[PDB]
């Protein structure tokens, strides 16, 4: 698996900014948003990996993702 950071497409980031009420979207916001999302995923998925390794499980459940989001003050409901 290589070049998967480009899976988050440019109109996907455009629609995400449209949900946030952004009037105009620059052409350099896409790489920065991809980097921010990569950093956030590299934190949350790593925390979920530690949670799964603690429980002697080989696949990561949604509850561990919920715990990893909750421990950083970003708690998620519905899972």
């Amino acid at each position: 698996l290589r070049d998967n950071i480009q899976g988050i497409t440019k109109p996907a980031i455009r629609r995400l900014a449209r949900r946030g009420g952004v009037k105009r979207i620059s052409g350099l916001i896409y790489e920065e948003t991809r980097g921010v999302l990569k950093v956030f995923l590299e934190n949350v998925i790593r925390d979920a990996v530690t949670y799964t390794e603690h429980a002697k499980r080989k696949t990561v459940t949604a509850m561990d993702v919920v715990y990893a989001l909750k421990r950083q003050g970003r708690t998620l409901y519905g899972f």
Binding site: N4, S26, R74
Partner: protein
Amino acid sequence: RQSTGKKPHRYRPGTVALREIRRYQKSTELLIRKLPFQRLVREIAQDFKTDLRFQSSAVMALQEASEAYLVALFEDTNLAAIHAKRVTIMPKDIQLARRIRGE
């Protein structure tokens, strides 16, 4: 290795952008596609530990959490843009918002 190689409508910018803002702000469905985000999640996870799997619901929760976090970050970025007497966002506004947030 062995190889040598009549008049169109012409909508002005901003009005359709506000139309999309109104359409997606009242909307509910997920903006980011499923499999590209899932493949990015697997690619990120393979750097930490190999032979790892994610269930469908865990990918769903990660996608919704990331979408909400990026929507809040874009809201703060747009607020800083209007705060800087602008309607176009810049990556330095995103960096400033991340610095203020402490992350």
